[PDB]
Symmetry: C3
Subunit: 256 residues, 3 copies
């Protein structure tokens, strides 16, 4: 019924899960993610038909992304890994209602959701290259189903932020609205969907999930990528990137 790190409300058949982790700017800490997951789980009932994920009204930062301090950081059972999986497999639609700036891991988190509705002032950025992190295959895969290849590559390689208007243009966002209408706009849609056949929505969603994951390869290729990842994890650049982050200074990458 209650959680330390999220606040939940139910409005008819729609449930809203609001973050309650502001000190860390909603960074994806284990305790935080665990509460989000418990909440979702608790909401997996016939009477609940649609979920909305959001940061508190007026938030400057929607989510800072991975919790560096807490630091292979992207292993199967890591929080971010677990949540994306859960969200994707959840039999009810999940809408990310965005207010504030979205960063790295949080960006992957919202991409994994079903729909994204955002304020005209929100911003988006994918940042593993800033810290020198060798992002995982599944993680990367999750960022390629909406905008095209070139676009995705620009986001990742530059780690530069994009406006909500651009995010809408490239296919990332569903709708962009004025912050004052965000909540209202999102709820209307949620209630609308909640009037539809839940069982059909569930199956279609899973069909989409399964098709979306269907980029297959042989074990040698996976092991080869994994070897590359290890090499990155073992590099100087990797240490340099984390420190600089922790040290709140510009990193000096050298290619080894």
């Amino acid at each position: 019924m209650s959680y330390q790190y999220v606040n939940v409300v139910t409005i008819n058949k729609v449930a809203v899960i609001e973050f309650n982790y502001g000190r860390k700017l909603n960074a994806l800490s284990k305790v935080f993610i665990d509460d989000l997951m418990q909440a979702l789980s608790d909401l997996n009932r016939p009477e609940i038909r649609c979920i909305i994920l959001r940061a508190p009204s007026g938030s400057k930062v929607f989510s800072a992304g991975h919790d560096i301090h807490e630091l292979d950081p992207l292993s199967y059972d890591d929080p971010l890994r677990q949540i994306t999986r859960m969200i994707q497999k959840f039999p009810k639609p999940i809408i990310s209602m965005v207010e504030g700036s979205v960063w790295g891991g949080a960006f992957e988190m919202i991409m994994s959701s079903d729909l994204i509705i955002a304020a005209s002032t929100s911003t988006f950025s994918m940042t593993p290259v800033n810290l020198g992190v060798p992002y995982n295959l599944v993680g990367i895969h999750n960022l390629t189903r909406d905008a095209g290849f070139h676009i995705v590559k620009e986001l990742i390689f530059t780690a530069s932020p994009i406006t909500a208007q651009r995010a809408l243009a490239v296919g990332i966002l569903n709708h962009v609205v004025e912050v004052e209408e965000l909540e209202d706009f999102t709820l209307q849609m949620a209630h609308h969907i909640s009037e539809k056949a839940p069982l059909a929505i569930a199956v279609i969603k899973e069909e989409l999930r399964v098709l979306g994951e269907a980029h297959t390869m042989n074990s040698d290729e996976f092991e080869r990528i994994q070897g590359m990842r290890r090499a990155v994890y073992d590099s100087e650049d990797y240490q340099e990137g984390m420190n600089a982050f922790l040290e709140k200074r510009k990193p000096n990458f050298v290619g080894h």
Copy 2:
């Protein structure tokens, strides 16, 4: 050479298949689809280079859709349209609904009137759409967009359809026919064999999302659960009974 449900006209290398089932709003009935398929088949000749599918001029409704086994009409037509060695352009005028949307999605190009509208509606009736069918709807617009389309069953405008990648071109209704024909004639000057093989290569790549038998069987199990649900009955009912369904999750 002649059909009950469709009218065909050939202009040099271009063939126009026009629906003739307005009384039923061009619903995807077996009879209708059977004629569509026959007409396509009859047009599979070296001298025909490009096909155009359309509803009669001035139509308010392009197709109402349904009236999902491997051999059901809709499944049959999408496969056929996809394997057809000639390009097939859907020239849309009017509102597009359900099965009809998948049908045009399965085609090579879609050119529509500035006033046309589109909706996928399986969630309105509680239908557990099939994997192949859903797959057919994921090659043009992004995942988040498709999910919105499908989950809301809300109509979108021709302008949004264009913006998200579903449509090739949107034009004033008065110019629709000519714009389409000109593009068709132009394609007809190109190498047909090359077009054919490239279309097929695209088709094969497009289907190349593979999975194991267990996954397939698992989805099949889920689908069956849907067809066996109360909600499913309620959905068919309400449609018939022309009333809003009351879904409950069982």
Copy 3:
């Protein structure tokens, strides 16, 4: 380093590879491609972090594309697209002028595409009756949707830089006067990021992008069709018409 068909200049951590074959409109000749590949290869050093591919300033034609199974594993275009894709540094295609045929696939295979508001693009295999290969076709499907791709290929009609942007092919469109500066700045910016991270992600993206698999029978079946095209009358006609600079007359056989 030096090459006959391309020029190279390094600016800090960025390297610019410029085509030097205007006499032939930068057609994708073997000797041209070989040079490009060597230049990339020579640039595969820790101090180089980003690459820019471009045609000379002012070019009216970025690349005419193909020069007279020509699409075999070891053909130049086949080799260069693989190279570009496997290159552990980002490769940005900076476009000024018109882009044609193979050159279009070439830029598509790169990481980002930034172009002049006046540039244009056309996929032309259907003009000549060429049975494009699977890998080649695949390379053209990761940016714009299916319907759009099919229109480009089926019509072989050129599209504007504005439309290329709108359908997802291009990253940015800029006024020629600002093309260079805009491109360089981004490249410099990329150069400040973690190279190793970039390389692994790029390779992950490549592997995922190729991951549309099929059985041997399907592939052989495609090959058989391709071969039938190559053996057709229309194939001869397309090549001849092109040489004789006259409109081809295709018949379906």
